[PDB]
Amino acid sequence: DYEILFSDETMNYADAGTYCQSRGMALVSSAMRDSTMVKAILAFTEVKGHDYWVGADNLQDGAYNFLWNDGVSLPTDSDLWSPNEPSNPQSWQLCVQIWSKYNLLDDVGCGGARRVICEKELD
């Protein structure tokens, strides 16, 4: 169960995190691992057909050691990934987005402007 916020305003990955945080929420993460919720989230972004930041990156352990912001691993072989991703140089700082080309996850550098999705676990 969640509160999911979608924003058409774009920002880099760091700013997306603080954007959600300032609202008492977090960049979407656990909701992406929830089979019902992730399906609803992707149904929305599918219509929008735009890139969105999600709360995962390799900043801590590097390479393809992707972590959701709540500390849970985003397996390199997850079905959430777009075909042939992740594929950027493992030595880069990598952030994860919902890539419009496939409406599935993708590794990118962290400076590009993208839309934002925030979550808040209920209760």
Beta-strand runs (E) in the chain:
2-11, 26-27, 52-57, 67-68, 95-99, 104-108, 114-121
Query: Contact letters (x/-) for a second copy, 32-71, by CB under 8 A?
Result: ----x--xxx-xxxxxx-----------------------
Min separation Cβ 53 and Zn ion, Å: 11
Based on the shown chain and the rule CB under 8 A, indicate whether residue 6 belongs to the binding site for a second copy.
yes
Q: Which whole-number Å values give the CA distances from 78 to 2, 48, 82, 110, 122, in the listed order?
A: 22, 23, 9, 21, 25
Q: Which two tokens stand for residue 102?
A: 């496939």
Query: Contact letters (x/-) for Ca ion, 47-86, by CB under 5 A?
Result: ----------------------------------x---x-
Based on the shown chain and the rule CB under 8 A, indicate whether residue 9 belongs to the binding site for a second copy.
yes
Q: Which residues contact 43 (CB under 8 A, 6 or more apart)?
A: none
Interface contacts to a second copy, rule CB under 8 A? 1-9, 36, 39-41, 43-48, 122
